Each structure stands twice: as C-alpha cells, then as structure tokens.
Design a protein around this ligand. Structure first.
Ligand SMILES: CCB1C=CC=CN1
Ligand SMILES: [Cl-]
Length: 161
C-alpha cells in the first residue's frame, strides 16, 4: 500500500463526469471539477484541466495524470500550511498517508476545524485522536471511508485497506 493505492480505493475511477458524495461534478479519481450546479461550467473546467475539448469524457491515462497532480498538490499544500506541516512532519509514513487522504477529500481549507485532533495526533495519543476525529461532519457524512482513514491514524498500519 501507498497513497495512490489508498486513494484509488477510496475515490474509485470513473471516466465520465459524475457527481461526488456532496453532489459536485467530478471526474477520474476524485478530481473535483467545480461546485457549480452548471454541467457546462464543469465541462469547461475539464477541458481546461486536460488541454483539449473532452465533451465530458477522459481516458484512464488522463485520469491518472490528474490524480498525480492532485496528490502532489495535496502534499505540497500540507507543507505550505503552518498549522499542518508540524503535525505532518511528526507522523510516520503510513499515518502521513492518512493525512494526505483527508486533505485530498476535504481540502486544506476544510480541515480548519480539526485543531484538537491535530494536537492529539502530534502528541501521539492515537486512541484519543481517533475518538476526536469521528466527532465530525466528515465522519457522519462518509463513515465507512472516514473509519478507514481513522483506523490508519490510530494504528499506523494498512489493516483497514
Ligand atoms: C487534517 C489533515 B491532516 C494534516 C496533517 C496531519 C494530520 N492530518
Ligand atoms: Cl459530532
């Protein structure tokens, strides 16, 4: 296991525009296109992202290219966030994957509400952190995926995958 295999499990692969768990137009491996309800706006974002007129459909190679870009942007964003970087750098490699997964799903400006979880993780109080992480809209809206990510934070193993 690694971050690519982990997110591939959690996000799936679809080659035509679809709506994600929040109702937002998405393609590929969890590549969010727009929060706009206008499919034409999503199609324009897709064409801009791929560099050609896609008419709402991409290839597997194109999906994997967007995925590589999105994972890299997620990690770099963590490193450029003064609240997230110290916690991320304190973690082992498996738990770092759980952190990337969470930012990939919720956006770096969507983890803002996780101050107390972040402190418990940096303290390595793993069971307490796991309890705190589940007291969240994140967990309640996507409980089976959140349970996998939290088990990864709790144990530092890939047992949930
Ligand atoms: C909330 C995402 B996250 C970022 C760094 C460390 C742990 N989790
Ligand atoms: Cl709650």
């Amino acid at each position: 296991m690694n971050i690519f295999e982990m997110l591939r499990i959690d996000e799936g692969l679809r080659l035509k525009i679809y709506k994600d768990t929040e109702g937002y137009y998405t393609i590929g491996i969890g590549h969010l296109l727009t929060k706009s309800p206008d499919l034409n706006a999503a199609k324009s974002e897709l064409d801009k992202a791929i560099g050609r007129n896609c008419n709402g459909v991409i290839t597997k190679d194109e999906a994997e290219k967007l995925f590589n870009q999105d994972v890299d942007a997620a990690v770099r964003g963590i490193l450029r966030n003064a609240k997230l970087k110290p916690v991320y750098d304190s973690l082992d490699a498996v738990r770092r994957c759980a952190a990337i997964n969470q930012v990939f799903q919720m956006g770096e400006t969507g983890v803002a509400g996780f101050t107390n979880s972040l402190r418990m993780l940096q303290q390595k109080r793993w069971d307490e952190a796991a309890v705190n992480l589940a007291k969240s809209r994140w967990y309640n809206q996507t409980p089976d995926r959140a349970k996998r990510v939290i088990t990864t934070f709790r144990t530092g193993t890939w047992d949930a995958y």
